[PDB]
Design a protein around this ligand. Structure first.
Ligand SMILES: Nc1nc2c(ncn2[C@@H]2O[C@H](COP(=O)(O)OP(=O)(O)OP(=O)(O)O)[C@@H](O)[C@H]2O)c(=O)[nH]1
Ligand SMILES: Nc1nc2c(ncn2[C@@H]2O[C@H](COP(=O)(O)OP(=O)(O)O)[C@@H](O)[C@H]2O)c(=O)[nH]1
Ligand SMILES: Nc1nc2c(ncn2[C@@H]2O[C@H](COP(=O)(O)OP(=O)(O)O)[C@@H](O)[C@H]2O)c(=O)[nH]1
Lengths: 158, 87, 428, 440, 428
């Protein structure tokens, strides 16, 4: 499965909007935060933003994460160059490619999907833990359509 | 840095001059590196990864301060009067 | 306490910085939420070299992020190990130096350098022995150069005695993006030679070959082209961060790798570099390291090091090794490749040795060499100058922003006087 | 009574200091903590430690060396490691900015911020010393903190303690292989200033250590720890007669009085006897005659200079262990008839034989349990070849202005290079009229 | 310590070398993943004659795989022992040879042997005392004759003092898998005469003959054929991988088996070759080992030894066997057959035994014969060449590539000039 048109046409402009709650009461000088997850199924990416009130404190801090994938087993160490790349290459000609069939090495990369992010779970986005508290109507439609669970009673943040 | 043998063992003092960092130490001020480095490393572990009411009554004659209620307390002596600060 | 201060001006530089900052945070076990979560002593001992502490192990990165347009600002901010760069250390702008050295320098940029040299001082004051400055500034393009060079000149003024290793991405003809690289970049050299002291020039082109003919990556993303450069950096200041024998510092290198005061344009290099499909077949021993750190592939610049002999090369090995082999492999390198080293500098290869390897390896060897072939590297940018300068094209948008054809002549004058000393020593 | 002060300057000096001090700790009973053990004892009773080790009340013993280095982290590993309790906290003198492999940064700019403290501690260590026997300076002829700081320390010690003997344990940079590029500059600029402030310079070369470890020790891959331990055995065996007892005890004034003929010619060569490596050590007869032949063999010499290309001047042999004196009398009689070892015509007797009744101790690791040793310290003419091989490098670098600005702009002046080369010409000159045969 | 560099060229050479590495891996106790799971510590004693060590016991062969199409490479990796080969010496190429010697030697082969020479230079430099090379190829057909001769010429030019085995599969008369086998063989032997120190001829008809008449197989496949060739391929070089008395290395065999400088083409043979139905009825010992050895049934080249005198012959025995039991029978062979051995060379038998035999067998041996019956093969290639050449048929590819009518007649003259000496030494 190394194609993009499948996801890019099944879920082109479909976004999973999750309201969440970051807990940083245990931080020394910190405080709890309001994170909004947007999972894009077209490229299996997670962006998360911070929604912040009037006369806030912290700046207009853009988004919190950006449009890439998310490593699910905590914060992993970045590796030496050319480890978590695409399909393994044996040699070059003499611009060229071979597609080695015996893939072995740093291919073991475990990442969130729509299955591992459901209402009521705590996700460890790069260290910190943030709990999923509510979702949108399109998300409710999608999770009734595919996985069949209803159970959409929200867990209200603070 | 935390090579103080950890736990509560004696070892915890980085020899004077140890140019090494003692995570959470310069943010403290008071005594000598030895006992500092000790408390300095301990700091990490924490999370790592009037007063006269009782027997001590009297308040001391002429005490500079206002014992709550003194203004309107006509009785025995500063001693007896201040035998219950937070009464 | 030897602290270092790293500048982050320019889209390119800001990105190389983030990946650089990741690696150094990924060696001192700094978590993308601040608190250190590593499990080694030698990690914290020297956190003063890059991460100032705070209330609650928040080791905030001593960084100075600057951009005339809040683009890479947010980009880096919303990044992975990027929600830690102090909010104040993030000086922003409201415009953008659309590829124009004039803008970056004698204009907008200038009216912000004050609001940039302001924080840098706060930093300097926060330090104890600022071992020097390290600027990730694309000589090419706007911001990067214009602003950077201005700060470079300015910083020196404040603290004269100091080191200045500029990791800069010189354009390599082959591939080009902005159509003003000749002009915009040309300028840098002038304000570099007379203010730099350890130029580590990198070339997107070269790094691409090193992401195809050495790592075999079908789709070499700029991200990887960053780690290769990022590594070189967190590999040079190794001694001032971890124990070991022959601890060579950011100064030692400059006092054994700079013959004449101006002859200081060096090229980079990282050793343990193989493909994802050969990690288990390769033998990471000393000989191998040398048989790659001394070729024309691991060098992250574009100037066949075999066109012109080198004057002074050095290497920072980092891992439990035996000086004997280090010394031999290097002495042998000379006797073997003897037509590629000046005969006016006996003993021309410095060999340091740390006592901590990079996380996920067992040995490492950053390469730094004052090659003479860098002559070509600059020759091309000058060879280009003319074309655009001849017909004074792409100049209206440059001279009408506080500039004069005069500057061009003087900048080129230096390019000639930089590609001049080389051919001289070319033959001792 | 007989106390010796060692000043370890430069990183090579500090690491060789760690080697020689761990050798002293495991040669006596002095523990890494500092208390001699309760339910153990060693040998020499209650006076043999009053050498390099110092006595304090209730038993906590202290060394009397001064570890000085203008950079940290290499002092920090020595202090943080397995000898954290032994050393006195202020005897470890740290700089703050690295001396940058520069004579000027060792000698004229960062030379004042710490030499007051270093001389202050030298005064305090000389206060607790009944007889100040001598100073041994452990340093390299390479980087800035080993060249410039040593060179700056020499004239202040010559001013304050002019009547005391001072000697050098030197890391000369190798004529073949080398590790830094301004080694010739730094070596000449430090030996110019230390020529008039050194009474004897024992010299050790890393390539010689390397191929001795290859050939005899059977290590195809040695490290600086293995080098400095073999240097440490040399140091401990030279300074042994003040520590212990034997038949002929060699004083540190006897070293200068028997080994330096002319006041300028004070550059001998150390070498060690059996450097065999355990799994091939018990197969050998291990005789006094054959170790006396092996030290004069031109492969165990601890600097890379060929002894056949010259004449010997004065050889000092220090034996340790069960050495019958008439074995060394027969060994010297066997030496004086071989034509491969040529002598000058003006030194008929040149062998300073000293015997100490104690065998070498063994650090857990490389060296073998051998009940014999001798260090051979010979003044030869062959060091002129090393001076030539380094002065050729200096001339070839000086001819075209290499690296001069880092020196001159930071405290040095342009002349000092030229008169340092003039002094090298004078020394290489004098080594020829001392070696020429008498014709008058 | 002595090391052999194995290069394999062409589809035939690649498959034979893959089966050879499978045989050696099962002999030296290495699983396809590359680790060691053996039974005896002596089995690892001299592993680095064929295997370069990697980290963690991941031993990989010192082998350069070369072909002009990336299909044989994909097949060799798709084989069972595929996780054993280094991807760096895995030199493929995107082209089509077309079974053309001109396209193997004067065309894209000549553009790819630069990379082949670079990687074999690296493998030869990473050695202690290199003794020689092992090129597995086919004498007839493309690549192995076109690229193979060029590779041998460059290897000999860069190393002129080392023993060079070329294990070459020669054409057969009764069947032909390629129309231009005479052209390709005549062009290849012109080089293979004056470069290689010794060459081992394999005829594919004799493999069929030894599979039906001796092995009693029903449908002999290429796996079985290249396995049987790999048996003697391994059996030649065993005195350097395992101990024994009368250990004879490659140069010892070269000295005792090359009497005259141009006569080095040999015939191999392996002789515990038992059919499954008749093996338990065999009394396997040295007598019938020698009897099965010296017959004209186990010869792997279709040249009948009764049609010519033996110049010299070596037997490499393997197993715990007794010395006069070898000696009385190796004298009895010459004393019985006196019209098949030369008289001007008295006692033309080399004997070399080894301690450990191959697995499952109690004793093996390898026959190496230098007969005067090779003139049959070379003269038959000569008239089969001249029949095709007199009409200039199938020649326009070679002539239009850049060759001419001139260069073929020296190859045919060299065919005849090896035909003369191997006949006049049989005629004394
Ligand atoms: N035995 C031993 N010799 C060393 C060691 N380190 C360095 N050397 C020798 O010293 C030479 C260079 O080291 P130094 O001269 O001490 O460098 P430095 O004096 O510390 O210079 P800075 O970096 O400025 O502090 C090398 O060529 C070695 O021969 C060591 O750890 N042990
Ligand atoms: N290695 C690397 N190069 C980059 C990156 N981003 C941009 N570049 C290079 O930077 C060059 C132009 O950048 P530039 O216009 O100077 O950015 P500016 O300094 O903000 O104006 C392009 O040719 C890119 O190849 C990066 O993240 N990594
Ligand atoms: N022993 C053996 N011989 C083979 C094998 N495959 C092919 N051959 C022989 O190789 C000969 C020709 O091969 P060739 O044309 O040179 O293949 P090429 O090198 O890819 O051009 C044929 O006559 C086959 O008999 C094999 O797997 N084992």
């Amino acid at each position: 499965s190394f194609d993009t048109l499948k996801q890019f046409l099944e879920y082109d402009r479909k976004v999973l909007r999750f309201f969440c709650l970051w807990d940083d009461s245990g931080s020394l000088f910190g405080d709890r935060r309001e994170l909004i997850l947007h999972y894009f199924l077209s490229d299996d990416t997670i962006e998360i933003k911070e929604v912040m009130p009037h006369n806030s404190g912290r700046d207009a801090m853009s988004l919190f994460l950006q449009r890439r994938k998310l490593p699910k087993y905590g914060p992993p160490g970045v590796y030496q160059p050319g480890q978590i790349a695409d399909r393994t290459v044996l040699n070059v000609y003499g611009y060229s490619y071979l597609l080695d069939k015996y893939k072995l090495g740093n291919l073991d990369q475990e990442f969130y999907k729509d299955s591992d992010l459901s209402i009521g779970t705590t996700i460890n986005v790069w260290g910190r833990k943030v709990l999923l508290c509510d979702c949108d109507e399109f998300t409710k439609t999608y999770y009734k359509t595919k996985y069949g669970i209803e159970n959409f009673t929200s867990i209200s943040c603070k | 840095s935390p090579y103080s043998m950890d736990d509560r063992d004696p070892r915890k003092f980085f020899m004077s001059g140890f140019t090494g960092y003692v995570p959470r130490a310069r943010f403290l001020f008071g005594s000598s590196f030895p006992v500092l480095s000790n408390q300095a490393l301990q700091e990490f572990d924490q999370m790592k990864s009037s007063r006269t009411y009782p027997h001590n009554l009297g308040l001391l004659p002429k005490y500079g301060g206002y014992v709550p209620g003194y203004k309107f307390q006509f009785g025995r002596t500063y001693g007896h009067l201040t035998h219950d600060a937070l009464g | 306490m030897r602290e270092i201060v790293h500048l982050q001006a320019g889209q390119c530089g800001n990105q190389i910085g983030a990946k650089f900052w990741e690696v150094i945070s990924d060696e001192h076990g700094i978590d993308p939420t601040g608190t250190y979560h590593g499990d080694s002593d030698l990690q914290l001992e020297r956190i003063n070299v890059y991460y100032n502490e705070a209330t609650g192990g928040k080791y905030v990165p001593r960084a100075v992020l600057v951009d005339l347009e809040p683009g890479t600002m947010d980009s880096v901010r919303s990044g992975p190990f990027g929600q830690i760069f102090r909010p104040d250390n993030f000086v922003f702008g409201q415009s953008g130096a659309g590829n124009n050295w004039a803008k970056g320098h004698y204009t907008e940029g200038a009216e912000l350098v004050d609001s940039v040299l302001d924080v840098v001082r706060k930093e300097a004051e926060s330090c104890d022995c600022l071992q020097g400055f390290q600027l990730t500034h694309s000589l090419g393009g706007g911001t990067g150069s214009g602003m950077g060079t201005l700060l470079i000149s300015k910083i020196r003024e404040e603290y004269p005695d100091r080191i200045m290793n500029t990791f800069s991405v010189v354009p390599s003809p082959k591939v080009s993006d902005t159509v003003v690289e000749p002009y915009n970049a040309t300028l840098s050299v002038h304000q570099l030679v007379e203010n730099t002291d350890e130029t580590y020039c990198i070339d997107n082109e070269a790094l691409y070959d090193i992401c195809f003919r050495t790592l075999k990556l079908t789709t070499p993303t700029y991200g990887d082209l960053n780690h290769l450069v990022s590594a070189t950096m967190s590999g040079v200041t190794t001694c001032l961060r971890f124990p070991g024998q022959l601890n060579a510092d950011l100064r030692k290198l400059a006092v054994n790798m700079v013959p004449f005061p101006r002859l200081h344009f060096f090229m980079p290099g990282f050793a343990p570099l193989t493909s994802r499909g050969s990690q288990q077949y390769r033998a990471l021993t000393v000989p191998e390291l040398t048989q790659q750190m001394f070729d024309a592939k691991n060098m992250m610049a574009a100037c066949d090091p075999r066109h012109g002999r080198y004057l002074t090369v050095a290497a920072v090995f980092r891992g439990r090794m035996s000086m004997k082999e280090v010394d031999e492999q290097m002495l042998n390198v000379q006797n073997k490749n003897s037509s590629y080293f000046v005969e006016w500098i006996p003993n021309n290869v410095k060999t340091a040795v740390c006592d901590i390897p990079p996380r996920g390896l067992k040995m490492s060897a950053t390469f730094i060499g004052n090659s003479t072939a860098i002559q070509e590297l600059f020759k091309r940018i000058s060879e280009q100058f003319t074309a655009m300068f001849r017909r004074k094209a792409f100049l209206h948008w440059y001279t009408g922003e506080g500039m004069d054809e005069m500057e061009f002549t003087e900048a080129e004058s230096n390019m000639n006087d930089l590609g001049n000393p080389v051919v001289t020593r070319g033959a001792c | 009574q007989r106390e010796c002060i060692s000043v370890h300057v430069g990183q090579a000096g500090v690491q060789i200091g760690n080697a020689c001090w761990e050798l002293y700790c495991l040669e006596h009973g002095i523990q890494p903590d500092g208390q001699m053990p309760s339910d153990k004892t060693i040998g020499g009773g209650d006076d043999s430690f009053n050498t390099f080790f110092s006595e304090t009340g209730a038993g906590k013993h202290v060394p009397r060396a001064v570890f000085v280095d203008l950079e940290p982290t290499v002092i920090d590993e020595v202090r943080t490691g397995t000898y954290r309790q032994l050393f006195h906290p202020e005897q470890l003198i740290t700089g703050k900015e690295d001396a940058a492999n520069n004579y000027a940064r060792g000698h004229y700019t960062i030379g004042k911020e710490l030499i007051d403290l270093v001389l202050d501690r030298i005064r305090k260590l000389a206060d607790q010393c009944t007889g100040l026997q001598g100073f041994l300076i452990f340093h390299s002829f390479g980087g800035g903190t080993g060249s410039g700081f040593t060179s700056l320390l020499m004239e202040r010690l010559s001013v304050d303690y002019g009547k005391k003997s001072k000697l050098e344990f030197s890391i000369y940079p190798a004529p073949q292989v080398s590790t830094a590029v301004v080694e010739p500059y730094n070596s000449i600029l430090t030996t110019h200033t230390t020529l008039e402030h050194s009474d004897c310079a024992f010299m050790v070369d890393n390539e010689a250590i390397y191929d001795i470890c290859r050939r005899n020790l059977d290590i195809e891959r040695p490290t600086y720890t293995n080098l400095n331990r073999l240097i440490s055995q040399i140091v401990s065996s030279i300074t042994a007669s003040l520590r212990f007892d034997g038949a002929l005890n060699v004083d540190l004034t006897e070293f200068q009085t028997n080994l330096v003929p002319y006041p300028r010619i004070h550059f001998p060569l150390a070498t060690y006897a059996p450097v065999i490596s355990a799994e091939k050590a018990y197969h050998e007869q291990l005789s006094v005659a054959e170790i006396t032949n092996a030290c004069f063999e031109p492969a165990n010499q601890m600097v890379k200079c060929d002894p056949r290309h010259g004449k010997y001047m004065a050889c000092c042999l220090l034996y340790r262990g069960d050495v019958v004196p008439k074995d060394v009398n027969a060994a010297i009689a066997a030496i004086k008839t071989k034509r491969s070892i040529q002598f000058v015509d003006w030194c008929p007797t040149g062998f300073k034989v000293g015997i100490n009744y104690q065998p070498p101790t063994v650090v857990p690791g490389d060296l073998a349990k051998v009940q014999r040793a001798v260090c051979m310290l010979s003044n030869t003419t062959a060091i002129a070849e090393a001076w030539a091989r380094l002065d050729h490098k200096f001339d070839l670098m000086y001819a075209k202005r290499a690296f001069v600005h880092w020196y001159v702009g930071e405290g040095m002046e342009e002349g000092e290079f030229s008169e340092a080369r003039e002094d090298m010409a004078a020394l290489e000159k004098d080594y020829e009229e001392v070696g020429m045969d008498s014709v008058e």
